[PDB]
Amino acid sequence: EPSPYVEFDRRQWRALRMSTPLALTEEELVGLRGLGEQIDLLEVEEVYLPLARLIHLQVAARQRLFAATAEFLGEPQQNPDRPVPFIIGVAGSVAVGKSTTARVLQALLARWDHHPRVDLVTTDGFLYPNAELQRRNLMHRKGFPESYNRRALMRFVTSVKSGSDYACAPVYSHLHYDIIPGAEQVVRHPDILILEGLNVLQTGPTLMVSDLFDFSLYVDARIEDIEQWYVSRFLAMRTTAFADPESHFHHYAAFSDSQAVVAAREIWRTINRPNLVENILPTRPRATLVLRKDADHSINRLRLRKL
Amino acid sequence: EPSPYVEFDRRQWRALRMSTPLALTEEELVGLRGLGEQIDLLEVEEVYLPLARLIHLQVAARQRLFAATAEFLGEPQQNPDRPVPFIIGVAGSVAVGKSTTARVLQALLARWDHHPRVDLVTTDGFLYPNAELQRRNLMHRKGFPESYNRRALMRFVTSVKSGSDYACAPVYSHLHYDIIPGAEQVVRHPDILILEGLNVLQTGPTLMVSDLFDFSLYVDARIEDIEQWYVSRFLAMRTTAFADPESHFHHYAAFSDSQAVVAAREIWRTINRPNLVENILPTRPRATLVLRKDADHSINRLRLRKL
Ligand SMILES: Nc1nc2c(ncn2[C@@H]2O[C@H](COP(=O)(O)OP(=O)(O)O)[C@@H](O)[C@H]2O)c(=O)[nH]1
Ligand SMILES: Nc1nc2c(ncn2[C@@H]2O[C@H](COP(=O)(O)OP(=O)(O)O)[C@@H](O)[C@H]2O)c(=O)[nH]1
Ligand SMILES: CC(C)(CO)[C@@H](O)C(=O)NCCC(=O)O
Ligand SMILES: CC(C)(CO)[C@@H](O)C(=O)NCCC(=O)O
Ligand SMILES: [Cl-]
Ligand SMILES: [Cl-]
């Protein structure tokens, strides 16, 4: 059977690095990794460097495509000191490390010849604020598609990709468990916009951000592994984030290893797992590149969309 | 508000024809038009010629894109006497003339310099045969997504776009109201494959043919107009197709103008309208170009996806 995909292992994949230079310290890599993420320079070299290359091959090529439409429309030539922004989506479960992957990718990409403006946005700030979620009865469905202002989100990316000079996104605080009053992220005609979130590859009766991506990643792992990473990160946060008296989950700091495992399993069981099964995992087939991770967080397989 | 779309009227649109030669007789145009379709050489010149141009601009450009992936993968160069096939989808309601649009487009495209192999396939032959539909309780939902062998359909297009030498599709008879035993359409590594059907722009938990399109059309009209075209074509078929004694709807031949209007309204009311509202119309936002038709079948507006 022919297939739109081709599978790789890490051997096959690292060969595709070719000449691509590594522009990252261990000290710089440190500052990009999230709690519980195990990435080192080797993983960057073998996994993230081929990837960065592929994307650069595609930016050039995907531009020829918009130029072709603008030529058809008898339009101005388009100054190359502001092309049409390349949009990259990053998806996958809570606790799977989307965050680290997107920051690493941003950093690699910004160290290209152009020195291109590479911005990074998470869909967190497009959550409805708590008071609106309370209203909609969705305080226990944060992360589900309906807990987002999808329209506001779509307006943002559309705004950016259509060549606007600036666009604003709201800002989410994990510590305070809500949207931050008055806070804005300002994206100014970047060259590349990475958009990171659970459900960014969703599709629907209306045009959505997944329709605007020129390239997508889905970070994947076995569901039980991800649960383990999630529970595990929950116990760890008892001495990082939960330890803050301002933390909306400061009550959790005091929990025993065992009470905390019970709490975290319950959250997984009722929110994050159902969302992964029902909404996120069904988006995996569309992703340009799936990064498969083994129980130790290691990316050891990849699935590339050839078609 | 910025928009992924740009609207045209026919004036704006016909300007975009530029130099593009017209290679069609009135006698050739005649043989491509379906019962009730009103297209003339003027419509071809003003509407179909810009369109054909846009597509040619895109074929070149979309090839640069697959070449970029193959370059990344360190693959052979790809002989230009067989690139990766350009796939065009054509969608819209029953009775809206998808058929005519796709045949016209095929004909225009095959009269390009390459003299390219342009094949045309409708999703009709991917219906389940009656006996299987009876089984699934779907004899009154022909045309709904679930009345198709979607997997078989996906296998077909995947097969073609992945460079296979040949792929087979089954064949549907309207006259006999069923799949034709033993009949095959054989598509042999075309340059361009046009895939025409109601639901070809649908999207879902699995990778679908809409994910393989490099360009799509959606032929649109006001729903009441389409009903009128449908009822109207039904009365007309009383002396064309229904007149055949072999016709599965030969009983309809004898109906009065008025009994027939009642029959056709009922079919619209119970099958074709619900499907248009529930499944087809929700796919319009993704289409590259929507062709809007006025009550006289005339394309007078267009919506192009810029993003
Ligand atoms: N303060 C706080 N931070 C959290 C919590 N959960 C996640 N985060 C932070 O949010 C970031 C996003 O985590 P998550 O949504 O699971 O996405 P991931 O990047 O795919 O692991 C992580 O780097 C965590 O540091 C939490 O419960 N409290
Ligand atoms: N024999 C027969 N042909 C039909 C019937 N309905 C549609 N057709 C043919 O099927 C072709 C497809 O029609 P339709 O499915 O409405 O698609 P359209 O091309 O968008 O109008 C048309 O050209 C008709 O000639 C029918 O009831 N009997
Ligand atoms: C992606 C976010 C930031 C939002 O869902 C996720 O990490 C989160 O906040 N989850 C918490 C789910 C809950 O406890 O309401
Ligand atoms: C697209 C097809 C050919 C199949 O739905 C359509 O024109 C059709 O056959 N409609 C008939 C619906 C019905 O009477 O069962
Ligand atoms: Cl999301
Ligand atoms: Cl279909």
Curated annotation (Swiss-Prot), chains A, B:
Highest taxon above the source species: Bacteria
InterPro entries given in the database record: P-loop_NTPase, PanK, PRK/URK
Biological pathway: Cofactor biosynthesis; coenzyme A biosynthesis; CoA from (R)-pantothenate: step 1/5
GO cellular component, one term: plasma membrane
GO molecular function: ATP binding; pantothenate kinase activity
Broadest EC class assigned to this enzyme: transferase
EC number: 2.7.1.33
Catalyzed reactions: (R)-pantothenate + ATP = (R)-4'-phosphopantothenate + ADP + H(+)
CDD domains according to UniProt: PanK (cd02025)
Keywords: ATP-binding, Coenzyme A biosynthesis, Cytoplasm, Kinase, Nucleotide-binding, Transferase
Chain residues that bind ATP: G92, S93, V94, A95, V96, G97, K98, S99
One BP annotation, GO: coenzyme A biosynthetic process
Pfam family for this entry, one: PRK
Annotated localization: Cytoplasm
Family from the record: Belongs to the prokaryotic pantothenate kinase family.
Other facts noted in the record for this chain: Was identified as a high-confidence drug target.
PANTHER family for this protein: URIDINE KINASE
Name of the protein: Pantothenate kinase
Organism: Mycobacterium tuberculosis (strain ATCC 25618 / H37Rv)
Species lineage: Bacteria, Bacillati, Actinomycetota, Actinomycetes, Mycobacteriales
